[PDB]
Paper text:
Larger differences in domain orientation between E9 and the archaeal enzyme make the model globally less reliable, especially since SAXS data are not available.
Poxviruses (members of the Poxviridae family) are large double-stranded DNA viruses that replicate exclusively in the cytoplasm of the infected cell. The enzyme is a member of the [name] family B15 possessing [name] and 3′−5′ proofreading exonuclease activities. A20 links both enzymes, and the DNA-binding properties of D4 are believed to increase the association of E9 with the genome template thus rendering the polymerase processive.
Author numbering: -3 to 306, 314 to 900, 904 to 1005
Amino acid sequence: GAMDPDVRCINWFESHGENRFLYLKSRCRNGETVFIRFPHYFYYVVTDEIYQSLSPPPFNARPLGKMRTIDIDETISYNLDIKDRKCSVADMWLIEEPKKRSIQNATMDEFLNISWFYISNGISPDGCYSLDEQYLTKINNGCYHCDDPRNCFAKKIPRFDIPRSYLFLDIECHFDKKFPSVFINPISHTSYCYIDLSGKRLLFTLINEEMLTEQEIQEAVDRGCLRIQSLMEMDYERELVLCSEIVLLRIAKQLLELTFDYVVTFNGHNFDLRYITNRLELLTGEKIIFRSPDKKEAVHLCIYERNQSSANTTFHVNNNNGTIFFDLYSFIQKSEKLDSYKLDSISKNAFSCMGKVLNRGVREMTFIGDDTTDAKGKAAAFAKVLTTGNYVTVDEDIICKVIRKDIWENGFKVVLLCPTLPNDTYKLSFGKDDVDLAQMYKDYNLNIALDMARYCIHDACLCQYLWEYYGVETKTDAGASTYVLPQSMVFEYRASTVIKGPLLKLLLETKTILVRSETKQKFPYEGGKVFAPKQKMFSNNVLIFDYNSLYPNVCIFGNLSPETLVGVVVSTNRLEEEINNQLLLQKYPPPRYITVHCEPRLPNLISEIAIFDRSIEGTIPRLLRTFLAERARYKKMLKQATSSTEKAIYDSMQYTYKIVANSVYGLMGFRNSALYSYASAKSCTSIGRRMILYLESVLNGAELSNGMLRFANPLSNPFYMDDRDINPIVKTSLPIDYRFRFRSVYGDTDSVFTEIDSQDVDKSIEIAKELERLINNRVLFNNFKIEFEAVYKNLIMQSKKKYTTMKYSASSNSKSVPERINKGTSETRRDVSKFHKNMIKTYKTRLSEMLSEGRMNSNQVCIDILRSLETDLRSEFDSRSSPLELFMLSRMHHSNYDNPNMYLVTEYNKNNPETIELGERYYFAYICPANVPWTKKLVNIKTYETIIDRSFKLGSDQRIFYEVYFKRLTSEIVNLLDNKVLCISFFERMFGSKPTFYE
Ligand SMILES: [Mn+2]
Ligand SMILES: [Mn+2]
Ligand SMILES: [Mn+2]
Ligand SMILES: [Mn+2]
């Protein structure tokens, strides 16, 4: 009977007919769901003078107050004759119109209608409300209409928790050589993971009958599977069902038309759903049909795309029913920087745990994980994935099937089909079930269909595991709140669009409108500035300091905004440059104005100087100031809340404010954007770069002796003269006996790395904490602060992208387990051989000791270690004492997509008693005839790849083709060195080739 008036908004969505509306989907405290319909309007902002003129009057209008409208067009000046920026004030009107309308000079045109709805009616997209039933009339069951949302939604109330419904799905399609085409290839499996409002999980997979033998189908039935002849006969409590492809497809249609809250896939929008839909249209006549919650609009499922050059394309479903069809692949690309976006990689990273060993031998290891073994509930997370996972990865390398599993709420005991090297502990990774599908389909029988079924249900459940892991639900709500957007639009729309809501709110609060009355000239701030460490290998510890949100703070410091730009003053020669500078300093003095040297915009200009008035806070800095404040709030709320549901909400809010803040720098240089300002963007780049150089200049050559830190330069504010004590000799609270010396070793857009002549990590942390304090209190100024993140022992670094170190964090002490940090790399188990590993490990240990002598050029180390390499290499090529075991490499056999490796294994099988079967792990080496001398040409090495089995003995008339292994080894060694010209000389002489340098 009676509707519950207490609702929590969870999505908003539009119909698009000639007769169009806005719809809300909300959830009551009980679990009932209320859809509410609102009439659509198109909003326009006009001046009072325009309002009064309007041909027929607008449907409705609310005044906005007086508002300053400002010309933000950017102009360069060749002298200091800079005209004031055009500014007018007028009473403004927000007008509502049911049909689109062209208004000759309407302002605020960039902002979205949906944003105006929320702002105007005073409605938060994710809020909870006690609806005033007085303003709702019913129209279907469950669906009401609201002509007056302002009054209906007048009583906002605190957040209550709600349950939600999910369908996670994945499908498998047949193929042999080409990528599956809908016209010829059938769907073989469809797997579903349904989460009910109760929390109950339902797993079911439909297998396509038509790809099995009548005898096999009956075997499946005999074994436990349900066979069905139509949609009508489907029992959803059966985990395995056999049916025709047409039935399977009809079942998909029925599920996809249901009003789940979320339908979640990994690349389902471009593949899985597209395929189901087209295949259905082919085999029967049928479409998949979504309907608005009042049944007024129906649409056929049609996947559409959205484009965004900086770059990628994303795919979206057009359902008008309130369901959020959400693709994890698209999302994980937008919101994470990763080397792989394959699902096995993303899962490997997300789901790992530490495994203590209980049994050994046979071909079966056994592990346990729990709170004792890794962290609190890291094993709980792993154990949830194990419910459906069938292959675990041991120690980054060993893929190996599960044989049995015991799962409880906090830990897992798992037994695995692998080799044996049993230490007390090992790392366990998850992800897919790895297979060769192409072969599975070629040989397809019942036991393979069931295998694929288990593989497929897991890829679906990975979507629910990753959805929990990335906190998508709460991020969606936080997004919707902060961006002033429907939940469904939060990760669909691009960054230039999501910033517009909070910008609009700011412009309204500051009674300001920004108008670009001109075509923007073309140029962004592209430059491609990438940063090279002073040396690669570090004997000493390295201290890591991060600026705090540098670019947000730079904009705040300089008050960088299109409308606070007084002007830009350019010069083509030094006379103009000097005259202009001396006039600049007279007419626009600090501290009210800041003047910023930028890279000049034209090639004939020798200087470009942007001048900003700091007296009246600019739009952009204030936007950022809000975002940092809001983030700060939520970080506190995060620590004061204790319910893990609440922790998640506040953690998301906090994240959302980080992201939107960091979007701003980019948006200032993106031409199609509401925050575009070439000068501001360039000035921001430039001020930040200067802050890096200032910090570096002060620390590079700095020493701590007695109680005093002797900064290497005076602590002068780099932009203008300052109240602060520039004295670089500074009292510290460290021990008098301490004597240390600092070197600026690397620095980038926001981070600075400082070598200290010391290996004692406990002291290094003591000192770095003091450095932090003095940098923040004496070196820096205004809103510029650094954190001391960590100490880096045994840094070996090529760039910020490729580096390896042990990391003692700021919490850390001398004797807690570091964090091994590897980045960018490609090797381990048979990618590289034991000869190589042993040689790299020695040449590192010899080289780190060489840097602790202090006696070196770049060259005296470089000459010394390359003499050593020749001597060891020529020695092994002569003596040949090293076993073949040291030169063996491994590889998995599999079918094509690789091509010469099938020829390698085929011919081995075709010529030898043993067979290397199609998922076996086989060994090989680079072997050549003994009568080949030191070779500096090269061929396709693939000819000297030689399968080494148990009965292989090295010919009396063969040798290990040492050159292959040597060339690879000295490549890795010269990339540790610093003298480049000496290394290239060596490598052309020894190998007749020019080396790689990871740049
Ligand atoms: Mn898939
Ligand atoms: Mn799959
Ligand atoms: Mn930090
Ligand atoms: Mn066989």
